Amino acid sequence: EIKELLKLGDLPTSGQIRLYDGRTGEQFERPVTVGYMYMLKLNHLVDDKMHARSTGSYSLVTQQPLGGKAQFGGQRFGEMEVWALEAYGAAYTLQEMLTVKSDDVNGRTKMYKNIVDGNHQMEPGMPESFNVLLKEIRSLGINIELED
Amino acid sequence: KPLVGTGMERAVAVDSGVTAVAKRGGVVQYVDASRIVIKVNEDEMYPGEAGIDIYNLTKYTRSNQNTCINQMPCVSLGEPVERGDVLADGPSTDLGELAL
Amino acid sequence: TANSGYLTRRLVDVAQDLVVTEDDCGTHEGIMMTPVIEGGDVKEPLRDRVLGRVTAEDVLKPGTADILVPRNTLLHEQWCDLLEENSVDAVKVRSVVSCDTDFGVCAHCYGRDLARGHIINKGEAIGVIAAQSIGEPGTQLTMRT
Amino acid sequence: SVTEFLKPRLVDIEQVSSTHAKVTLEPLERGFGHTLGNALRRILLSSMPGCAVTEVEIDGVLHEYSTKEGVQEDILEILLNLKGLAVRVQGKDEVILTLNKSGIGPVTAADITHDGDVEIVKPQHVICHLTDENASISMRIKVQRGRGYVPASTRERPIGRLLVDACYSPVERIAYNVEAARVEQRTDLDKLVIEMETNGTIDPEEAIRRAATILAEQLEAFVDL
Amino acid sequence: SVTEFLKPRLVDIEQVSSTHAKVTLEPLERGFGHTLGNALRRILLSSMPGCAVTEVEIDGVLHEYSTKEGVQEDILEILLNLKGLAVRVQGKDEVILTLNKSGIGPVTAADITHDGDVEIVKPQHVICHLTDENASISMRIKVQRGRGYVPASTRIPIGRLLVDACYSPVERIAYNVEAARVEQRTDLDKLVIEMETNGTIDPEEAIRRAATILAEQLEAFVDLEFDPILLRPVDDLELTVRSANCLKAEAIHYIGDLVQRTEVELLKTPNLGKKSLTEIKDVLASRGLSLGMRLENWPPAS
Amino acid sequence: VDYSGRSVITVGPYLRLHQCGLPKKMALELFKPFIYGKLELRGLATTIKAAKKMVEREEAVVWDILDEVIREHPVLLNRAPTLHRLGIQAFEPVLIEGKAIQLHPLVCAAYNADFDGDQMAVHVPLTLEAQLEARALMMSTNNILSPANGEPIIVPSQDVVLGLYYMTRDCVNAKGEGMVLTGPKEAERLYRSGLAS
Amino acid sequence: TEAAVAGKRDELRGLKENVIVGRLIPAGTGYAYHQDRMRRR
Amino acid sequence: ARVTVQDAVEKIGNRFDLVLVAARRARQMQVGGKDPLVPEENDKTTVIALREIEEGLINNQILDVRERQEQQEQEAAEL
Amino acid sequence: VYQGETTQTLQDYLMWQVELTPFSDTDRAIATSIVDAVDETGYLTVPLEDILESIGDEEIDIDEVEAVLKRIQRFDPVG
Ligand SMILES: [Mg+2]
Ligand SMILES: [Zn+2]
């Protein structure tokens, strides 16, 4: 029936015609299936997907960057990414991910100042979440401390 | 319209309350981009009543997904209409058929 | 997917601290490697099981007492070709399980990097690499009976 | 001689319609037919200039997402209809047309106020419809010349001035064919037939000449090198 | 404004060899790179005047599939060697050459009989190898003038061995289109053409002649710094006499020079005490400037 | 972490193996302190607030500054879930127009990614050690063998395989059959001229 | 609970322990740093 | 530019030590006043250091010897 | 669980601008003292003699404090 309808419209039965390249004008070596299809635009727009951040706001407790695009949030570097970095042997990249980018308050300021001055060096420091963990464990009646 | 369908587009378009459907038959007395006034036939009019149906169309309103809901008339001035006919097309609707 | 993730997380946790911290431990122990034969079919030849490994003993010719491959030799492609020339069906090699190194393993008991062409360097976290290598194809397996 | 090439000339121009034409170039050497045809098609489809509507003002409207009482179409649909208006401006690079209409019926391009330097090539182009007897519409339409596609986003204005994306290209489609030409005493010459479909706002011969001039001016850089 | 188009500004030429060249042109209007490249490639491949060998006659050979005694190569090998021979002809459009050679060694293009009109671009071009001492080669070669490539199959006496005719000097040509950006416009083309010739003419000359041919084909239709405050003199600041004298002695004339001077260096300057340095810092602070600013290349050739 | 972003990925067929396609709107935000430092370095801005306002206004010179500062500075591309260490790789950015990240096809197998809605995250190394680790350890050109088994990970697939298979095939009676050629260049010249199949 | 009862002490020798406290892991490019620390200790 | 670092790895012998040596040289060229030992072509300090290492002009022993010589010269010229 | 967000006040902005300004150690301490004594409306709430006393060093005159204050007064917002 489709072939009969194509014949009624003076069109090839096979549904394939000859096409030419728009940049060179030469014919493609094989017939190409050309027709009409119903296409839909889905509710996944890149305008709602693209997001980037250099610096912004942080949590009051963990002092880490917030999440989401509604706020000027950062991307989460989870355990699997840490494993991937460990498998490469890139210790400095992991260390700068852990301290000067997320939750080292003095390290963030020092790194920003050094970057603005053209000195690409960092002072790692101690994450704040470790201090929060120490305080929370001490609140349970357990004496945990750093020594030496 | 899909131009290649299955025959279920009209049922989806009508059963969904996105379109304006004539409650009673008559003649299009007034047509506008925002309102439609239908003069009801005298054989469908209730006693002691001026027989007119007024349809106020939804124009550029926000949906739950922050999209646009807008209704467009699909009838002309003075043409006859019957009960169940489509008077306005809602979003993703073309002459009473689903058009995604 | 969740089962694969749990398995790979446990595998990473159990071996996260294993690092190549030595060049040679001097051990003589090892494991015997033979081709994998099931019934009347060979699913794994000897070449793919000893390639890139270090011999734990002198490999002798089957009919004589002549050393064909000396001890502490990294079996590259040419050594495998030499072994298959003389029809060798069992080679004793060094493995990380039989390693005398304390708090880590040595390069000789591990062997080839498998990402480069040379022997493994010191300071490589081979436990995490192993856990990721085992866990990555976990989504290609079947979970339902 | 083998270093001397016979050069083509414009032989026949056929006006099948007001927006459909055929142009004949003859004679051509072996291989020059496609070589000229592809370049001419690309230049005609890419670099032709024309006039387009860019700005609209309606008395009673504030933005494109509203409706006017007595008009069956939304303002956005009216703007979309105006995007397709074909106008030939012969004296300036910018003009403002005025439209005034009242009474029940279709409002088309023939209702635009006459101007000496402005020609409307399709008077039957429907713009909108008035459904109320006591309904009138008055608008000012800004038309200017350019080339290519310029969305309004890429290019303060008072409230009520509506921007419309400009498509200045007058050419709708181009096709070309190479046939065997019948010259006096040779059988190794070709003839190039160019079928051109436009909106009726440009002469085919001047379009061909403009494309040839563009090609020559772009190619003159390779002559010196 | 509607009839003006971009023109190439940076035409870079890389000469890989005497016959191989690479040309780069940018910027171009969107889509024009493909147009120009395709047109030039088609012209340089199909329609390019030149001179080439057409057919040969060997005394001892009567058929294409034969066996010549004493010659290391086959007859079709000799035909392939002849197809690669590039010859310049100025006098006529059809010349005949003779090759007669006896002995042992490589018979090459240097052994052809000399003629005023005929010029051989590569006399070292190997034609064949003569092995036996009592062996000789005798052949007659016809060279004609034409355009492009003509296979010998389309042309299908006795002993006339046909050879594919390659009149076009171009041996290879390819083009590529890449992205280039002006400060505002971004969707613009950059054209790179790599071409190798046979040695008769230069690649630049071949490109020029192809462009000239295409242009003549259309004759019937073509119608005719730093911030300004840094450049102000140090006399702009209302410094005291002593401070001004110290700065003049320190060979400081502009604000940038003083700005690039650190406090430690200025402290060691004779006749410049801490009070004068504090005054200088104060007058710099009144304009939002400090003493610890660095500049890559401060003097702007002025 | 800071200095990070994400967006949808498209295919860049023109890219080299060590290159990626980065939108310039993302790059302007990612490299903001570097842009501030470079603006202050060459006298365009005399204070930090001047550079801040210049970047906010998006002047013409800040794009040249960005192009200069992103010249040789690797960025890390990661796709979740990161099943192995090949899920994070280092690339040299190329500034592009739009909002999608262009990805080299040959590295799509290591990421297990396809162009039907996938999104990737981008991270910027800060220190010299991090940049040199990205260039010498996490660069794509360094990852050509699988650490699990030693097999290559840059296997061509689909369109490239189809094209190479089509071009390297013979037909019994094709145009131009039975002639002798001086070399590959003559074969290409014959093919482009329509004289041989 | 078991560690608190036993009064255990952690030497921070593994990768995860150094990741917790934001130090260089004793592997890859951080191996020389830990070797130098051990030699100086 | 740079696409591969295989030659530098072969010269140094280890990928992990190459990063440290190149970082040391790049920090000398960036923060310090040292000039490159190779003709720089619009390259950054990391790429310049890698090119210097590839040519054999820079290694750990050379850097240590240069540091010792500079310290001795400074201590001698201090008086 | 709720944690909240860190908000940037006038003093945070002033200290951020101070840290990115080529000050010396003494000048940075003076700038910290000056920024400390700034109220919500942007006015200095103490005389410069109090700032000089708060510095705690006997080698600094009122002129250096004046210069640092004039440099700070040109930050954003101006005044
Ligand atoms: Mg997908
Ligand atoms: Zn061992």
UniProtKB/Swiss-Prot annotation, chain B:
Signal sequence, renumbered to the chain: none
Biotechnology: Co-administration of salinamide and rifampicin or salinamide and myxopyronin suppresses the emergence of resistance to both antibiotics.
Post-translational modification: Acetylated on several lysine residues in the presence of glucose.
Family: Belongs to the RNA polymerase beta chain family.
Source taxonomy: Bacteria, Pseudomonadati, Pseudomonadota, Gammaproteobacteria, Enterobacterales
Subunit structure: The RNAP catalytic core consists of 2 alpha, 1 beta, 1 beta' and 1 omega subunit. When a sigma factor is associated with the core the holoenzyme is formed, which can initiate transcription. The rRNA transcription and antitermination complex (rrnTAC) consists of RNAP, NusA, NusB, NusE (rpsJ), NusG, SubB, ribosomal protein S4, DNA and precursor rRNA; S4 is more flexible than other subunits. In pull-down experiments interacts with CedA.
Coiled coil: none
Domain of life per record: Bacteria
Physiological role: DNA-dependent RNA polymerase (RNAP) catalyzes the transcription of DNA into RNA using the four ribonucleoside triphosphates as substrates.
Species: Escherichia coli (strain K12)
Full-sequence range covered: 697 to 796 of 1342
Protein name: DNA-directed RNA polymerase subunit beta
Swiss-Prot record, chain D:
Catalytic reaction(s) noted: RNA(n) + a ribonucleoside 5'-triphosphate = RNA(n+1) + diphosphate
Location of region: Alpha N-terminal domain (alpha-NTD): 1-225
E.C. number: 2.7.7.6
UniProt keywords, alphabetically: Acetylation, ADP-ribosylation, DNA-directed RNA polymerase, Nucleotidyltransferase, Transcription, Transferase
EC class name: transferase
Record PTM text: (Microbial infection) ADP-ribosylated on both alpha subunits by the phage T4 protein ModA. ADP-ribosylated on only one of the alpha subunits by the phage T4 protein Alt.
Effect upon mutating R42C: In rpoA112; temperature-sensitive, blocks RNA polymerase assembly
Molecular function terms from GO: DNA binding; DNA-directed RNA polymerase activity; protein dimerization activity
A GO biological process held by the record: cell motility
Cellular component GO terms held in the UniProt record: cytoplasm; cytosol; cytosolic DNA-directed RNA polymerase complex; membrane; transcription elongation factor complex
Stated family: Belongs to the RNA polymerase alpha chain family.
Record text on subunit structure and interactions: Homodimer. The RNAP catalytic core consists of 2 alpha, 1 beta, 1 beta' and 1 omega subunit. When a sigma factor is associated with the core the holoenzyme is formed, which can initiate transcription. Both the N- and C-terminus interact with different regions of transcriptional regulator CRP. The rRNA transcription and antitermination complex (rrnTAC) consists of RNAP, NusA, NusB, NusE (rpsJ), NusG, SubB, ribosomal protein S4, DNA and precursor rRNA; S4 is more flexible than other subunits.
Full protein name: DNA-directed RNA polymerase subunit alpha
Gene: rpoA
Full-sequence portion shown in this chain: 4 to 234 of 329
Swiss-Prot record, chain F:
Assigned protein family: Belongs to the RNA polymerase beta' chain family.
Signal peptide residue numbers: none
PTM comment, free text: Acetylated on several lysine residues in the presence of glucose.
Species classification: Bacteria, Pseudomonadati, Pseudomonadota, Gammaproteobacteria, Enterobacterales
Function: DNA-dependent RNA polymerase (RNAP) catalyzes the transcription of DNA into RNA using the four ribonucleoside triphosphates as substrates.
Subunit structure: The RNAP catalytic core consists of 2 alpha, 1 beta, 1 beta' and 1 omega subunit. When a sigma factor is associated with the core the holoenzyme is formed, which can initiate transcription. The rRNA transcription and antitermination complex (rrnTAC) consists of RNAP, NusA, NusB, NusE (rpsJ), NusG, SubB, ribosomal protein S4, DNA and precursor rRNA; S4 is more flexible than other subunits.
Gene (UniProt): rpoC
Residues at which Mg(2+) binds: D114, D116, D118
Protein name: DNA-directed RNA polymerase subunit beta'
Species this chain originates from: Escherichia coli (strain K12)
Swiss-Prot record, chain I:
Superkingdom, taxonomy of origin: Bacteria
Entry similarity comment: Belongs to the sigma-54 factor family.
Functional description taken from the UniProt entry: Sigma factors are initiation factors that promote the attachment of RNA polymerase to specific initiation sites and are then released. This sigma factor is responsible for the expression of enzymes involved in arginine catabolism. The open complex (sigma-54 and core RNA polymerase) serves as the receptor for the receipt of the melting signal from the remotely bound activator protein GlnG(NtrC).
Protein name stated in the entry: RNA polymerase sigma-54 factor
Organism, scientific name: Escherichia coli (strain K12)
Interval of the full protein contained in this chain: 111 to 189 of 477
